[PDB]
């Protein structure tokens with residue numbers, strides 16, 4: 001049970017949550033701050 | 049004629065190395081245990097223009113190299129583009145353009161393949177004899193996978209597992225809806241069709257694919273795909289929902 | 292406890308401890 | 317552990333991209349039958365388009381224009397045509413209209429750029445050689461080129477309204493496929509540093525970690541390695557085609573051991 005819980009927690013790190021990508025470096029290297037903030041907010045909510 | 053496909057037509061779906069893991073993927077695959085079309089192009093000859101659909105699994109067993117290429121295109125005339133590939137004795141002539149093809153196209157061994165060619169845009173140069181191919185046209189890319197295996201069977205398909213590897217990638221954008229094979233005249237082969245399906249792929253420690261599971265073949269396969277394993281213990285398991 | 296082994300375990304404890312098996316960044 | 321250096325590697329490219337074949341061209345196709353060009357295997361500099369004089373529309377979707385000189389792409393598609401001054405707005409995702417629905421549907425999930433230029437001094441005659449399609453039984457799909465009569469000729473004439481003058485517009489579509497990058501842009505590559513926490517740039521993969529010599533047996537077509545949790549584990553060298561092993565920098569928690577303050581003021585750290 002403990003191993004399964006940890007595995008699920010780790011796998012939830014590759015989800016999109018409605019953003020354009022699941023990588024912070026990608027969106028930081030592609031977009032400008034004003035909209036990067038919105039999509040980073042979406043990712044933050046999912047991870048929380 | 050019809051025969052059994054067994055477990056043939058598995059190819060590497062990505063350029064990512066993996067080892068000692070069971071990975072689930074979705075792509076266009078040849079469904080397991082399907083009834084594959086068996087053809088005698090010339091026995092008397094019937095070598096027609098077959099639809100391409102979403103892809104073609106091509107496999108044949110030959111020694112005399114009677115098969116030398118294929119014709120890809122929608123109209124197969126000089127009106128619009130068409131792809132022509134020829135397996136030379138020294139290279140490959142990969143070239144696509146309008147080709148007012150002949151009613152009985154074949155390499156003159158002169159060019160009895162086609163009558164006229166013009167307006168060309170691209171050109172590329174680069175018995176236990178079982179040859180296997182996978183041809184796809186996605187996003188305008190023409191992808192070719194292949195694998196050569198010593199199988200002593202001509203009139204059927206063998207049993208076992210072997211994974212096809214990428215051979216050529218072509219950024220063309222050509223519109224293809226039909227295809228036809230080239231023959232050399234001074235010829236038996238098979239044609240399958242790929243479908244959207246999900247598979248469970250087993251990777252050896254060296255990155256070699258060694259086993260697979262068709263997730264929609266039967267209830268036991270659904271159970272195996274759900275539990276992420278190739279062995280199932282005793283008991284009852286809930287697999288899906290109906291409606 | 293078995294005095295002849297580096298780990299001061301009995302035989303039954305040794306049997307028990309061999310049946311249970313078995314991301315930083 | 318903080319990183320110390322940065323590692324940058326780029327592929328074998330010296331060719332320049334043929335942007336001038338379209339941007340400097342003198343012949344432009346009709347809006348109903350567009351001209352598509354494939355650009356690849358070259359260095360691309362977008363600062364000239366960013367700094368181009370007399371540019372009217374320059375809007376990047378999903379990328380920022382200033383950060384476009386540091387990215388790499390599988391391929392870039394350049395498409396050219398001439399449009400009216402008033403019809404420029406229709407070339408955008410989520411837009412409807414005569415051209416947007418009957419000439420060229422720009423997809424909603426499109427990534428790339430759109431650039432428009434006024435071409436009255438070069439195309440105006442009335443130049444009826446440019447035709448815009450007016451009738452369909454259904455709206456066009458994205459990237460489709462379908463070629464009362466459906467086609468109508470443009471009134472590109474001198475002294476016409478600026479919203480009716482011919483406009484040269486180029487649609488740049490950027491693609492990010494699994495294939496290794498072909499269009500990279502100008503950047504200087506360095507050598508390899510081993511056994512240190514460093515910053516990584518093996519285009520298009522970036523990250524941080526520790527590089528050692530990998531003994532993984534990649535296949536010739538194989539570029540990347542991944543772990544059980546779908547995490548990067550190996551990379552190929554863009555210039556020497558060698559496998560490199562990745563290990564994260566060490567980290568952990570810091571705790572302070574202390575007796576009461578009433579007795580001492582010295583502590584130990586774990």
Ligand SMILES: *[C@@H]1O[C@H](CO)[C@@H](O[C@@H]2O[C@H](CO)[C@@H](O[C@@H]3O[C@H](CO[C@H]4O[C@H](CO)[C@@H](O)[C@H](O)[C@@H]4O)[C@@H](O)[C@H](O[C@H]4O[C@H](CO)[C@@H](O)[C@H](O)[C@@H]4O)[C@@H]3O)[C@H](O)[C@H]2NC(C)=O)[C@H](O)[C@H]1NC(C)=O
Nearest residue numbers: 067068250251252253254255256257258259531532533534
């Ligand atoms: C996944 O990858 C692993 C490696 O990590 C593979 O395991 C090795 O596979 C190779 C096959 O390519 C094996 O090599 C062969 O081993 C035979 C038996 O080895 C024993 O006997 C020899 C006798 O000298 C001993 O030295 C050895 O230590 C073993 O005790 C050898 O008889 C073979 O030699 C013959 O072929 C070579 C080819 O180069 C000739 O040069 C020789 O002269 C001779 O004719 C050969 O060396 C290797 O043994 C495997 N490793 C282990 C530890 O067993 C997996 O096979 C691979 N799996 C997949 C699916 O890819």
Ligand SMILES: *[C@@H]1O[C@H](CO)[C@@H](O[C@@H]2O[C@H](CO)[C@@H](O[C@@H]3O[C@H](CO[C@H]4O[C@H](CO)[C@@H](O)[C@H](O)[C@@H]4O)[C@@H](O)[C@H](O[C@H]4O[C@H](CO)[C@@H](O)[C@H](O)[C@@H]4O)[C@@H]3O)[C@H](O)[C@H]2NC(C)=O)[C@H](O)[C@H]1NC(C)=O
Nearest residue numbers: 335336337338339340341342364367368369370371433438
């Ligand atoms: C085809 O593609 C080429 C490049 O591949 C383009 O060439 C560029 O054209 C632009 C104009 O659109 C140039 O920008 C201008 O450059 C002028 C340079 O003139 C000096 O240098 C030449 C030598 O070539 C001398 O003969 C000349 O006497 C000058 O000493 C500048 O003078 C311009 O500055 C003026 O205009 C700007 C407008 O923004 C004002 O802000 C300034 O204050 C000033 O008044 C201007 O900078 C650019 O330099 C060219 N590049 C190259 C490499 O040649 C073509 O334009 C393009 N053609 C088409 C039709 O698309």
Ligand SMILES: *[C@@H]1O[C@H](CO)[C@@H](O[C@@H]2O[C@H](CO)[C@@H](O)[C@H](O)[C@H]2NC(C)=O)[C@H](O)[C@H]1NC(C)=O
Nearest residue numbers: 133134135136137138139140141142155159173
């Ligand atoms: C098949 O291969 C032969 C070579 O064995 C080709 O003949 C050569 O083709 C090249 C074209 O790349 C020419 O440059 C040479 O001059 C040719 N040599 C001779 C002796 O003819 C032939 O064209 C190939 N044909 C096909 C259909 O693949």
Ligand SMILES: *[C@@H]1O[C@H](CO)[C@@H](O[C@@H]2O[C@H](CO)[C@@H](O)[C@H](O)[C@H]2NC(C)=O)[C@H](O)[C@H]1NC(C)=O
Nearest residue numbers: 326327328329330505506507553554555556557
């Ligand atoms: C791609 O180009 C780079 C140049 O930046 C090559 O690196 C040098 O290539 C020349 C030949 O063009 C060699 O003589 C040098 O010895 C190379 N230097 C180093 C440090 O490697 C690089 O080899 C090229 N890549 C390929 C695959 O050809």
Ligand SMILES: *[C@@H]1O[C@H](CO)[C@@H](O)[C@H](O)[C@H]1NC(C)=O
Nearest residue numbers: 049050051052082083084085
């Ligand atoms: C395979 O199935 C097809 C129908 O899908 C059938 O026509 C054919 O006879 C079958 N062949 C065999 C060997 O069962």
Ligand SMILES: *[C@@H]1O[C@H](CO)[C@@H](O)[C@H](O)[C@H]1NC(C)=O
Nearest residue numbers: 121122123222223224225226
């Ligand atoms: C490809 O050709 C067929 C005709 O065989 C046509 O129906 C189809 O619309 C064409 N597709 C494209 C993308 O041109």
Ligand SMILES: *[C@@H]1O[C@H](CO)[C@@H](O)[C@H](O)[C@H]1NC(C)=O
Nearest residue numbers: 126127146164165166167168
């Ligand atoms: C070649 O294509 C051009 C237009 O691209 C056309 O005008 C010409 O008639 C074509 N000729 C042949 C022989 O196909």
Ligand SMILES: *[C@@H]1O[C@H](CO)[C@@H](O)[C@H](O)[C@H]1NC(C)=O
Nearest residue numbers: 574575576577578579580581
């Ligand atoms: C130190 O001692 C005083 C009484 O002498 C007490 O009030 C205080 O809480 C003590 N502080 C600590 C850290 O133990």
